[PDB]
Structure formats: structure tokens, C-alpha cells
Structure 1
Amino acid sequence: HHMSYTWTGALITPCAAEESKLPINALSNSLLRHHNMVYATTSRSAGLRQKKVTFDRLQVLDDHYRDVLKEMKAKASTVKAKLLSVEEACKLTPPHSAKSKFGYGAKDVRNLSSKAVNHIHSVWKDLLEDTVTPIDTTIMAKNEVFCVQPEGRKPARLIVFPDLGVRVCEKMALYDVVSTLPQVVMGSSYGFQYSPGQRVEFLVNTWKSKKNPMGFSYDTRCFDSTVTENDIRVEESIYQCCDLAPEARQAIKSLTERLYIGGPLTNSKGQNCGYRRCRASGVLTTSCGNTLTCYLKASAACRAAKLQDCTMLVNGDDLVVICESAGTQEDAASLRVFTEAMTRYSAPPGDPPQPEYDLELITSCSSNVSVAHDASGKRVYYLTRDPTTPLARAAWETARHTPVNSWLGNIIMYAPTLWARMILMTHFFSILLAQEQLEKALDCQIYGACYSIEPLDLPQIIERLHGLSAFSLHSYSPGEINRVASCLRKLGVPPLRVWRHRARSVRARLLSQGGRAATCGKYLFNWAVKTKLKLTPIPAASRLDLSGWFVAGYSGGDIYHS
């Protein structure tokens, strides 16, 4: 047997008390009334998750697989990557990253304190000398917020991560590799090179490039658990194709043998929970490995299915394919063959894929293309998503400070959307005004990495990522309007006419503050008035350093880019 996990029966334990019920304050009702619809996952459901993620993996690897792999390795061989110094790697550590078990924390690391640096060096030396001993990991249940979907409650997802010292060593060995290799190997198919607008451009251009377009998303069941020892060694063989220093080569070999392939699982109480033989969700290579492995399996599956003129877009375990239609029956047939190949590769689907002939109806990375109209009346395509989870998370953040501010990330990613503009902007700017906290920088995450963002910089950030049109879109699609309306009914969110009324108040209060606050009032809330101000390029926008923002995925990888 080739089991993803083996377990001792020891429990996955929490670090602090965990809340599952939505916390309520005086502001909660202004956002939503159906409080019992929002929950957070806790370690209490960890056993249910363990059951779901534990299975035997079988893998049959054919000529299509090896052909694509050869191609990937040929591209990888053009990459030159560098070792990061200790200091460079230390500066990439989030200020609140989990402290080391060895007597120092993330602040000590960021400050280059002697004890941290010395220990990191000792971890590094040990990686070079020893390429066999499994490195310890901690297993935790993630506390994440969702809306109930009777389609009831998700069990908590699991996070598996090594000690802080090792994580700094992972950056040193592989940060440059995971940041540069995937776009070289996968080209335009690598999803994390795109801002949301650029992703939309690629998808729309790809769709228009087909005579008779068909598209489909592919949902792998428990992707991390599907990743085998084979997959992880194949990933390492790809990394090693790069032009690397011998010390980097040795560290990558060692991290592969000792950490990436598998290792002991330890709870928060120091007890042995069992043993992992699949992808660790909390390592630097999580996003890059998943993306490469998904792309490899899917590219080979496309060949097996004989899909005509197909283009892929891959973000970790998330996959969308757009190809040439051969008719509805022939397409259904192709997807069945595609699915069979993926399954043989260890990657069977949760929901079976279905052919889609309307681009707007294809969901990938929880998102879809939709269309609205700019100030001139021109059709504009933009990225959107079902607002349920963003709004459930905003409900939580209304009553509780959290390490990651999802509302702020969601405004950045989904600025052009009806719901981010009318609800998220209005609600959160009301709150920040009330506490006079417009100037206070908040942590958020973009493609897995951590940023400290000042809400007063939102107009310039949005202009840079989405263009000026994000401040003037109107006439959204009836499909998008219905979806938003359905979500508001479900969660008990006030109707859009109430948000319009509130936004006029927010806009006025922001304008009354002048400076950056007034720019926010002017640009972010121009949709809320009949008396529309003239929106011109903001000078500060061109000065914003937004490099590294949409380059690569770092989910689980403990990266701070501020």
C-alpha cells in the first residue's frame, strides 16, 4: 500500500481556544442578519478531515507523461537560480510567523539576532551533511470561515509545516527557483504571473482564439493527498535541471529526501500523530510543486484525450482547459478520457468535469470572467466570484481582529466587481472612518504571500492593477446581479439600495478629510452619486512598487513581501 497518511490515534490539537460561532458586535447587523449561517472550522472536525485525506494512491505512468516531462525538463534547464543569503531569507519571514522550537521567534529572525542566525546556519550545515533523516513537522487544524452549504459544514483543513529555522533554509535554497522556474517551464499557462485583469485577458484571448470554443475546469479530490513520492521526486528532478550552485543542489536534494517526500507529524502538544507520504501543505514548494505536478499530469491527459488546440491555465491544484469543440457528444467523450488519464495519474476528480460553451460559466480559482460597461459604454471583461465566502469572512472581521484581513485582499483582487464596490468598500471605509484608522497598515495576502497595505493607498493600487475603468463600471450582467442578490438573501445582507445610501455618507465623510482620504472618497465612491466627479490618473500610482505582486504563488510558503 501507498497510503497518503498513517496515524497513531493521537489527536490534532489547537494552540488556543477556537471559536466556531460568528462573533457579534454592534456593527454586525449592518452587514448581515443571518449569523447562524457563518461558521469557522476548528480542530474539533480534524478527525473527519483525516478520514477524507487518508487513502491508497495508485499511479500508472505512460509515454504521454514521460514526453511532457522531458519537455518540462528541457525548459527548466534554461533557468539560472541563486542561493539567498541568510539576511535576504530572514527579511522574507512574516513578522508573526510561528516561532522556532529552539528559543527564538519571527521578530528575532527579521532582526538577524545572533541566536536565530546561528541556529539557521546550524540547520543549513545539517541539511548539507545529512540527506536521509526525516525532518519533524507540526500538524494543525486551520481556523477558516465559511457559509453553511447543505449541498452543511466543511471539516477543518490541515496545515503541515516544519520549524522556523528550516523554513528560512527553504527560502535560501529555493525562493529564487519557485519564483522563476514555473513561468519558464509552463509559459503562458502559469496562472500566478497574472494580475486578475491579465488573467481575464488571457482567458478571453484564449477563448476568442478557438473557432468553436469549449472549456472545462478540473477539480482534483484532495490534491495534496494525491501527490505521491514519485511526483515529489519528479519535481526535484525538475528543480535540479536549473543552473544552481552545488550547495543549492545539495540543500534541495536534502529537503526533498527529508521534508518534501514525507515525515513525522507532531501535534501542538509535542505528540506523534502519524506520518505523511504526500504533499505537505505548509512548505515553500507547496504552490510550485502542485502547479508543476498538475500541469504535467493535465498536459499528458490532454494528449491522451486527443483534445484539439488546447490551452491550459494552472494555479496550484486549480486547472482550466480551453480547446476546440468537436461537437457536444465528442466533447463529453474527450472529457471522460481526460478524466480516466488523470485518474491513472493518481488525480481523480471530486465533481466530474463538464464541457462549458459559455466562458462566463467557467469557474477556476473560485472565480469567473464576467462583463460590464465603462464610462464610455464599451464592454469590459473583469474577474469576479461568488461573494458568499468574502462576505462571511467580512462578517467575522467586523467583530474580530484577525492576522489576515480578507476584506482588504478581496477589494484589491475584485475592485471592479459590483459587490466589492457597493458592500466591502462601503462597509470597511465606514468602520475605518469611525475609528480614525484610515492610515493604519493592515496585513493581507495576495497569491499566498503576506503584504502590509495601507487602506489609503487603495485608489492608486486599484488604478495600477485594474485601470481607471474599475471606478466607473456599470450595467453588470443579469447573471452577476442575480448571483449577488441570491447571496444577499442567503446571508441577510441589506439590499444594494441601502449600500448606495451608505456610500454617499462614507464618500462625503472621506472628502471632508482631504488628502488621501478624499481621493478614496472621490475615486472609490464615484459610483454612488448622480453628480460624478472627473476621475484622472493619480500621480502617486506610477510611483507604487508593485513588483513581486503577481509573479508567483506562495500559498503555505510563509512569505512576506513588505
Structure 2
Amino acid sequence: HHMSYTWTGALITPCAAEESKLPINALSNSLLRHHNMVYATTSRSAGLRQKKVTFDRLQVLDDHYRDVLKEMKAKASTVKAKLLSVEEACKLTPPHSAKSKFGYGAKDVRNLSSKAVNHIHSVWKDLLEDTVTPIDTTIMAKNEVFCVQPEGRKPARLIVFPDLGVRVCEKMALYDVVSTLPQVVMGSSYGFQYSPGQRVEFLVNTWKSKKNPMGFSYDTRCFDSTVTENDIRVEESIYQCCDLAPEARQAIKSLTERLYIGGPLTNSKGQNCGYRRCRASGVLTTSCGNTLTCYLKASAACRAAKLQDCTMLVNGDDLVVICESAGTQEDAASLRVFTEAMTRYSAPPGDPPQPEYDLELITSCSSNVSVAHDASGKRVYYLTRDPTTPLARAAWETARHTPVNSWLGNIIMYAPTLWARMILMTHFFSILLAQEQLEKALDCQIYGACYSIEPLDLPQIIERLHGLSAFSLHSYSPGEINRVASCLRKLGVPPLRVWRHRARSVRARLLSQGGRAATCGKYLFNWAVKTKLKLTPIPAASRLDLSGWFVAGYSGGDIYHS
């Protein structure tokens, strides 16, 4: 058999006490009242996840697959990639990354302390000398926050990661490769090269370039678990097409054989849990690996399905295709052939794909294009999403300090949206004012990479990424207004009129502070007043070093870009 996992029966175990019910404080009810709708996943559901992820994989690889692969390799051959030094690798480690089993932590790595650096060197030397010994990994259950959807509870996802010293070695060999190769191989199809605005631009331009557009998202069931040894050796052979240092070629070969293809799973108590023969969800190449493999299989499946003039957009396991419609019947037939092809390549669907004839109704990366109007009254497309999970996570973060602040990532990514502006900005600026913590930098994630960001820099960060229009958008679409309102009903969030009222208060309190706080008041909350201020380009915006921001995806990859 080619089983994704085999298990010993040892349990997947927590590192600390786990909360599942929403923590409540004095601030909780101002945001939401239906507390029993919000939950965190815990290891107590890890057994259920183990069932879902454990299955046999069969792969039948045809001429389309090999044709597409040869093309990808030809493009990869044009990539030149560099080895990172120990220090450069060390500075990309998040301050709160999991510590080494070998008696040093993430801060020791970042400070380049001699015990960390000595060990990292010993790990590197071992990778070069040994290309066969399976590398130990830790299996953990992720604690993530959701809203119940009987339309109730998701089991915890799994995180599989090697030791801190190995992770730093992965950066040395592969950070430059994973940061640059995917855009070269996939071109405009590589989703992580785009800001939310550029993503929208790509999708709308792509949609308009078809005579009769049809689009679909493809949901692979348990994508990580569908990735086979072959898939992972095919990824490596793509990596080796690059112009690389001989030490990097050797480390990539080694990491592939010893880590990427598979390895033993160890719980937090040090017990052997079993064996993985699929994608590790917590390695540097998780995102890039998933993007390459998804694109390969999808492109091949498009050829199999004889889809006409198709354009793909791929972010890891997330896939959207836009092509030329052949009528509703023929399109449905094409999708079943596409799905059959993907299934043959070991990427069977969860939800079967369905043709869509309205761009706004296509969800990909949990997002969709929507329409609003700017200052001049012109129609503007922008990226939004269903606000349920952002608001459930916000409710959690209202009562709990967490290492990654999702509200802040969401404000950054969804700044032009009705719900991020009216609810998230209003709510969190209100708390930060009260606590006098406006100037305190908070950690957040964009495309999997960690950033340290000061909420006082939101106006200029937003201007740089979204333009000044993100502060002027009005007259959102009925479908969008209705989705937001239905979500507020579900969670028991105050209706929008209450938030407008609150934001005028938050705005005046910020203005009163003067300076950066007043800029936040001025720009972020101009929508809240009838008497509108003049929003001019912020001189600070042009000075922001926003390189590395929307270059690549690094989910699971232990990346810090501050």
C-alpha cells in the first residue's frame, strides 16, 4: 500500500492546557453575544483528523502530466538561486518559533549565539554527509478558532515540523529557491506574487479576456495527504533545474530523502506516533511544493479536459481556473473530466467543482471579487471575504493574547472592505486607545510569513497596498451588505449602525491624541463622519520598506520578515 500515514497508537499530545470555548472578558459583548458559536480546535479531536488524513494513494501519470512537467522544468532551468549564510537564515526565524530539542531557542538563533550556531553548522554538515537517515519530526494538533457550521465542529488540523536547527538549514538551502522559483515556472498563475488589489486586477482582466467566461474553484480533499513520494521527488527534480551551489544541490537532495518524502512522527511527550509518507505541513517547501504540484496536476488536467483558453491561479492547494465556456452542459462535462484527471493524479475533490458564470460568485483563497464605488463615484473592484472566521478570531483575540494577531492581518489584507473598516478597525482601535497601546508592535501573518507591525502605521501601510481609495470606498453591493449582515446575525454582533456610531467616537478619541494616532483617526475613519476631511498622500507611505510582502507564500515555513 501507499498509505499517507501509518500509526503506532501513541496519542497526539498537547504542549500546554488547551481552551476550546471562547474566553470571555469585559470587552467580549461589545463585539458579539453568541459565544457558543465560537470554538478553538484542540488535540482532543486529533484522532478524528487522523482518520480523515489516512488513506491509500494511487497515481496514474499520463503524457499530459509529463508534457506539462517538461515545460515547468525548462522554465526552472532559467532560475539562479543562492545559498543563505547561517546569519541570514537565523534572522528569518520568528522570535517565538519552537525551540530546539538541543538546548537553545529561537531568540538564541536570532542573536547568533554560539550554541545555536555551532549546532546549526553540525546539522548542515550532517545533511551534506548523510542523504538517507530519516529526520525526526514533531506532530502537533493546531489550536485554531472557528465559528460552528453544522452547515458543527471541524477537527484540529495537524502540524508536522522538524527541529529548529533543521529549519534554519532548510532556509540556507532553499529560502531563495522557494522565494523566486514559483513565479518563474508559473508566471502570472503564481498567486502569492500579488497583493489583494493585484489579485483582483488579475482575475478581472482574465475574466474580461474571455468571450464567454466560465470559472471554477477546485477543492482537493486533504491536499497534503494526497502528495505522494513521486510528487515530492518531482518537486526536487524541479528544484535541481536551478543554477545552484553544489552544497545547496546536496542539501536539497538530502532534505528531500530524509525529510520531505517522509519520516517518523513524534508527539510532544517524545513517543513515536507513526510514519508519514506525504507532505509535511510544517517545512519550508510546504507552500512552494504544494503550489508546483497543484499547478502541475491542474495544468495536465486542463489539457485532459480539453478546456479552452484557460488561465489558472494557484496559491498552494488553492486553485481557480477561468476559461472559455462551451455552454452549460458541455462545461459540466468538462469539469467531470477535469476531476477524473485530478483523481487519477491523486488529487480527488472534497466538494466537486461547479461552473460559475459570475466572477463575484467564485471563491478562491477564501476570498471573492466584489464591487464598490470610490470618491468620484466610479465602480471599483476589490477583494473581500465572508467575515465569519475573521470575526470569530477577533472575538477570541479580544479576550486572549495570541502570538499571531489575525485581526491585524485581516485589516491589512481586507482594508477596503465594509466589515474590516466598520468592525475590525473600530473595535481594535477602541481597545488599543483604552489600553494606551497604539504604539506597541504586534505580530501578524501575511501569506504565511510573520511580520511585526505597529497599528499606528496602518494608514500608510494601507495607502501603499490598496491606494487612497481604500479610505473612500462607499455604496458596497447588496450581496456583500447582505452577507455581512447575515454573519453579524449569526454571531450576535451589533448591527452596522451601532458600529458607525462607535467609529465616530473612536475617530475623535484618536484625533485628540495628535500625531500618528490622529492620522489613524483622519484616514481610517473618514467614512464615519458626514463632514469629511481631505485625505492626501501620506509622506511616510513612500518610505515604507514593503519588499518581501507579496512575493511568495511561506505557510508552515517558519518565516519572519521583520
TM-score above 0.5? yes
Gaps of 5+ in 2: none
- 1:69-117: per-residue Cα shift (whole Å, max 9, x none)? 0000000000000000000000000001000000100000000000000
Instruction: Measure, in 1, the Cα distance between the counterparts of 2:76 and 2:21.
Output: 47
Q: What are the residue-to-residue correspondences of 1:197-346 with 2, within 5 Å? A: 197-346=197-346
Report the 3-state secondary structure (helix = DSSP H, G, I; strand = E; otherwise coil) of the residue aligned with 1:309. strand
Taking the aligned partners of 1:246 and 1:33, their CA distance within structure 2 comes to 59
Aligned-residue offset at 1:307:
0.3
Looking at structure 2, the residues matched to 245 and 510 of structure 1 have their Cα atoms a distance apart, in angstroms, of 53
Aligned length, in residue pairs: 562
Could you tell me which residue of structure 2 aligns to residue 81 of structure 1? 81
- Residues of 2 paired with 1:477 and 1:496: CA distance? 15
CA separation in 2, counterparts of 1:116 and 1:505?
Answer: 49
Partners of 2:462 and 2:212 in 1: CA distance: 34
Q: Post-superposition shift, 1:283?
A: 0.1
In the alignment, the residues of structure 2 paired with residue 95 and residue 24 of structure 1 have an alpha-carbon distance, to the nearest angstrom, of 28
What is the rounded CA distance, in whole Å, between the counterparts of 1:407 and 1:151 in structure 2? 24
1:475 match: 475
How far does residue 225 in structure 1 lie from its aligned partner after superposition? 0.1
Equivalents in 1 of 2:124, 2:351: separation in Å?
Answer: 43
RMSD: 0.3
Q: CA deviation at 1:387?
A: 0.1
Secondary structure of the residue aligned to 2:107 is helix
Distance in 2 (CA, whole Å) between partners of 1:357 and 1:184 is 30
Give unmatched runs, 5+ long, in structure 1. none
Q: For the residues of structure 2 that align with 1:245 and 1:81, how far apart are their CA atoms? A: 8
CA distance in 1, matches of 2:128, 2:433: 53
Deviation at 1:406, TM superposition (A): 0.1
The alignment partner of 1:512 has SS state of: helix
After superposition, the C-alpha distances for 1:394-426 in whole angstroms (9 at most, x for unaligned) are 000000000000000000000000000000000
CA positional deviation for 1:238: 0.1
Shift of 1:453: 0.2
How far apart in 2 are the matches of 1:546 and 1:532? 29
| CA positional deviation for 1:393 | 0.1
Shift in Å at residue 222 of structure 1? Answer: 0.2
Deviation of the 1:240 alpha carbon: 0.1
Deviation at 1:68, TM superposition (A): 0.2
Structure 1 residue 521, shift from structure 2 partner: 0.2
Helix, strand or coil: the match of 1:291? helix
Cα deviations by residue, 1:193-216 (Å, 9 ceiling, x for unpaired): 000000000000000000000000
Cα distance in 2 for residues equivalent to 1:271 and 1:3: 21
Matched residues in 2 for 1:426 and 1:240: separation? 49
Q: What are the Cα deviations for residues 258-312 of structure 1, in whole angstroms up to 9, with x where unaligned?
A: 0000000000000000000000000000000000000000000000000000000
What is the TM-score with the length of structure 2 in the denominator?
A: 1.00
Once residues 297 and 362 of structure 1 are traced to their aligned partners in structure 2, the CA distance between those partners, rounded to angstroms, is 21
- In the alignment, what sits opposite 2:101? 101
Task: Output the CA distance in 2 between the equivalents of 1:452 and 1:383.
Answer: 23
Q: CA deviation at 1:229?
A: 0.1
Distance 1:31 1:245 in 2: 53
1:57 aligns with 2:54: no
Matched residue SS, 1:539: coil
SS in 1 for 2:540: helix
What secondary structure sits across from 1:560 in the alignment? coil
Distance 2:364 2:437 in 1: 35
> 1 CA distance for matches of 2:494 and 2:526?
20
* Distance (Å, rounded) in 1 between the aligned partners of 2:40 and 2:367: 22
Shift of 1:474: 0.5
Other structure's SS at 2:404 match: coil
Give how far 1:343 is off.
Answer: 0.3
Q: Give CA deviations for 1:173-226 in whole Å, capped at 9, x if unaligned.
A: 000000000000000000000000000000000000000000000000000000
Cα distance in 2 between the residues matched to 1:521 and 1:228: 52
CA–CA distance in structure 1, aligned partners of residues 342 and 59 of structure 2? 10
Looking at structure 2, the residues matched to 92 and 378 of structure 1 have their Cα atoms a distance apart, in angstroms, of 42
Alpha-carbon separation, structure 2, partners of 1:512 and 1:436: 13
CA shift, 1:7, in A, is 0.1
Distance 2:482 2:505 in 1: 26
- Distance (whole Å) between structure 2 residues aligned to residue 218 and residue 96 of structure 1: 34
C-alpha separation between the residues in 2 aligned to 1:501 and 1:480?
21
- SS in structure 1 at match of 2:19: coil
1:187 is paired with a residue of what secondary structure?
Answer: helix
Q: Aligned equivalents of 1:511 and 1:496: distance in 2?
A: 22
Residue 46 of structure 1 deviates from its aligned partner by 0.2
1:445 and 1:537 mapped to 2: Cα distance?
26
| C-alpha distance in structure 2 between counterparts of 1:338 and 1:455, whole Å | 45
Find out whether 1:370 has 2:370 as its counterpart: yes
Structure 2 matches for 1:21-60, cutoff 5 A? 21-60=21-60
Partner Cα separation in structure 1 for residue 151 and residue 530 of structure 2: 42
Once residues 553 and 164 of structure 1 are traced to their aligned partners in structure 2, the CA distance between those partners, rounded to angstroms, is 20
1:466 is matched with 466
- Cα distance in 1, alignment partners of residues 535 and 188 from structure 2: 33
- In structure 2, how many angstroms separate the alpha carbons of the residues matched to 1:90 and 1:322? 41
Q: Shift of residue 151 of structure 1?
A: 2.0
Alignment identity in percent? 100
Equivalents in 2 of 1:261, 1:337: separation in Å? 29
Distance in 2 between residues matched to 1:54 and 1:534, nearest whole Å: 58
SS of match in other structure, 2:437: coil
Distance in 2 of aligned mates of 1:379 and 1:292: 35
Once residues 359 and 168 of structure 2 are traced to their aligned partners in structure 1, the CA distance between those partners, rounded to angstroms, is 42
Give runs of ≥4 in structure 1 deviating > 4 Å: none
- Cα distance per residue 1:461-481 (max 9 Å; x no partner): 000000000001001000000
1:330 is displaced (CA, Å) by 0.6
Q: Hey, what's the Cα distance between the residues in 1 that align with 2:290 and 2:478?
A: 36
Deviations 1:134-185 (A, max 9, x none): 0000000000000000021000000000000000000000000000000000
